[PDB]
Design an enzyme around this catalytic site. Structure first.
Site, short mmCIF file in Angstrom:
data_model
loop_
_atom_site.label_atom_id
_atom_site.label_comp_id
_atom_site.label_asym_id
_atom_site.label_seq_id
_atom_site.Cartn_x
_atom_site.Cartn_y
_atom_site.Cartn_z
N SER A 46 0.81 -1.21 0.00
CA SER A 46 0.00 0.00 0.00
C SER A 46 0.85 1.27 0.00
O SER A 46 0.31 2.35 -0.12
CB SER A 46 -1.02 0.03 1.14
OG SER A 46 -1.95 -1.05 1.06
N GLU A 145 -5.10 -5.59 -5.75
CA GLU A 145 -4.63 -6.72 -6.53
C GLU A 145 -3.09 -6.82 -6.47
O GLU A 145 -2.53 -7.91 -6.52
CB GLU A 145 -5.26 -6.84 -7.93
CG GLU A 145 -4.80 -5.77 -8.91
CD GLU A 145 -4.83 -6.00 -10.42
OE1 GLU A 145 -4.99 -5.04 -11.19
OE2 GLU A 145 -4.65 -7.16 -10.86
C1 LIG Z 1 -1.69 -2.20 1.72
O1 LIG Z 1 -0.58 -2.50 2.10
C2 LIG Z 1 -2.90 -2.87 2.28
C3 LIG Z 1 -3.70 -3.67 1.24
C4 LIG Z 1 -4.95 -4.32 1.80
O2 LIG Z 1 -4.02 -2.82 0.15
C5 LIG Z 1 -3.66 -1.88 3.17
C6 LIG Z 1 -4.37 -2.53 4.35
C7 LIG Z 1 -3.73 -1.86 5.56
S1 LIG Z 1 -3.28 -3.11 6.78
C8 LIG Z 1 -3.51 -2.13 8.31
C9 LIG Z 1 -2.53 -2.57 9.36
N1 LIG Z 1 -3.07 -3.72 10.09
C10 LIG Z 1 -4.27 -3.69 10.49
N2 LIG Z 1 -4.77 -4.68 11.22
C11 LIG Z 1 -2.55 -1.09 5.00
C12 LIG Z 1 -1.58 -0.56 5.71
O3 LIG Z 1 -1.34 -1.01 6.82
O4 LIG Z 1 -0.89 0.33 5.22
N3 LIG Z 1 -2.70 -0.89 3.73
#
Ligand SMILES: *C(=O)[C@H]([C@@H](C)O)[C@H]1C[C@@H](SCC/N=C/N)C(C(=O)O)=N1
EC number: 3.5.2.6
Length: 267
Positions: A46, A145
């Site tokens: 992300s 994705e």
């Molecule tokens: C990207 O890395 C993630 C993907 C689902 O697109 C999202 C989801 C969150 S996870 C949050 C941390 N843990 C929670 N229980 C995320 C992130 O943490 O940056 N991006």
């Protein structure tokens, strides 16, 4: 000496967690750097959402986009992990609020709406990074994705160094003018997802802006940050990690500790 010893501790740390750790840290004042596996490739997960928000801000500044322009999406099948976009689907959101949501909550719907409509998909995102001198970054797939983090897949990867250098340019450099730069920096400071990562590695009276990534597979997680210490020049910290097996879980403590180690190195 302080660099070689720092490296030993990162190497023992990756040994303790049974994976791979990439680090690049910059003291912007002294120009001191520290790097471990800084030119090796690691999934973005992300974390590119931090660069996406800056892309939007660059468009705004060239007056191609209004920060208050309304974005409507009431018929869209919202992506998983759209905590912000989900709540406002009925009314829509300002571009600014969408862009900041993509960064500050890692909102997949916000990320993907912005990439379809404004930024020219993944390749446009890639073009944006190229346009600031980042030659490692590549985005291949759409948000959500792209999080497969399959070992040896070079899709949707960058290096710790490149991430740090890009962050430096955007958060502290001259890609964005003073106004929209300040909005960018506030956005970063208000991130909600990284209290256990780089933020946990610094005294509480230091201000941090960061963006995290957590693929949910191969124990793959990251964090990158601008750090404004008190009585000291800004720092950049970039922390990328993978693990061997698909069901390996990511390690916040490992990121936090790598961050402590990195910061020591450039002190
Ligand atoms: C990207 O890395 C993630 C993907 C689902 O697109 C999202 C989801 C969150 S996870 C949050 C941390 N843990 C929670 N229980 C995320 C992130 O943490 O940056 N991006």
């Amino acid at each position: 000496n302080k660099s070689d010893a720092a490296a030993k501790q990162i190497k023992k740390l990756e040994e303790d967690f049974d994976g791979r750790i990439g680090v690049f840290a910059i003291d912007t004042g002294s120009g001191n750097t520290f790097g471990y596996r800084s030119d090796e490739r690691f999934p973005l997960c992300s974390s590119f959402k931090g660069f996406l928000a800056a892309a939007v801000l660059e468009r705004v500044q060239q007056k191609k986009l209004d920060i208050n322009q309304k974005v409507k999406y009431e018929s869209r099948d919202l992506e998983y992990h759209s905590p912000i976009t989900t709540k406002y689907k009925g009314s829509g959101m300002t571009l600014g609020d969408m862009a900041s949501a993509a960064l500050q909550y890692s909102d997949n719907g916000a990320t993907n709406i912005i990439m379809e409509r404004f930024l020219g998909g993944p390749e446009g995102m890639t073009k944006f990074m190229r346009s600031i001198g980042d030659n490692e970054f590549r985005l291949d797939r759409w948000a959500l994705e792209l999080n497969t983090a399959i070992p040896g897949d070079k899709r949707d990867t960058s290096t710790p160094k490149a991430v740090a250098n890009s962050l430096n340019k955007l958060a502290l450099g001259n890609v964005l003018n003073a106004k929209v730069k300040a909005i960018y920096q506030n956005w970063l400071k208000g991130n909600t997802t990284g209290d256990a990562r780089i933020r946990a590695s610094v005294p509480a009276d230091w201000v941090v802006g960061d963006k995290t990534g957590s693929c949910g597979a191969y124990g793959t997680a990251n964090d990158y940050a601008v750090i404004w210490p008190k009585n000291r020049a800004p720092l950049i910290v970039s922390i990328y990690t993978t693990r061997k097996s698909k069901d390996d879980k990511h390690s916040d403590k490992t990121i936090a500790e790598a961050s402590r180690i990195a910061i020591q190195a450039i002190d």
